[PDB]
Design a protein around this ligand. Structure first.
Ligand SMILES: CC(C)CN(C[C@@H](O)[C@H](Cc1ccccc1)NC(=O)O[C@H]1CO[C@H]2OCC[C@H]21)S(=O)(=O)c1ccc(N)cc1
Lengths: 99, 99
């Protein structure tokens, strides 16, 4: 389908056995979620946004259900103010911008 | 047009006779541009994202052109690391997300 942008484009995602709301964010390179538990190995990384840098945990090959797709993605976990779906996952579900 | 998200979605914008590169960002409520001079009244605004908050200047009713689509829109100016086109302008040019 098609999603307009008068409202913040939140979608429900299923990850780590949890249901979460996350913002579809074409301005994000990466998918970044608030503090949560995920299984498996991780490595720490620094990322930066509008306000400066934060430390995140990088989990690879994490299954995510989003917009009717069964995806597998890298997920960063850390102190973001909002769960964000970045282009790494938007590309994987065939999402595009159109005007 | 239609824009894939395998690369960052930068487009050329025209504002006040200036050409700039800006990110089409569905995660941003409002357009925010790197430090520049604009005419007319402004008021301070706080915005927030990854890494914290920044103070910006809010200018209303500024003409901006994107890929031949003209809008009159609110433009925030301040210490963003990148020029960002937000939902307030994306809606005015008819931009949607498509799966
Ligand atoms: C965190 C979002 C809810 C809001 N942001 C827009 C977002 O697209 C920024 C836009 C952005 C882009 C580059 C640099 C700074 C901000 N991207 C971002 O923080 O992504 C980070 C995770 O992926 C990495 O890729 C880029 C930075 C990392 S924001 O830049 O803070 C912002 C907030 C409010 C307004 N009006 C305008 C912009």
């Amino acid at each position: 389908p098609q999603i307009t942008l008068w409202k913040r484009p939140f979608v429900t995602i299923k990850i780590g056995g949890q249901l979460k709301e996350a913002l579809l964010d074409t301005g994000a390179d990466d998918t970044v979620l608030e503090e949560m538990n995920l299984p498996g190995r991780w490595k720490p990384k620094i990322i930066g946004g509008v306000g400066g840098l934060i430390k995140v945990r990088q989990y690879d090959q994490i299954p995510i259900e989003i917009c009717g797709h069964k995806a597998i993605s890298t997920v960063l976990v850390g102190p973001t103010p909002v769960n964000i779906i970045g282009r790494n996952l938007l590309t994987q579900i065939g999402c595009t911008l159109n005007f």
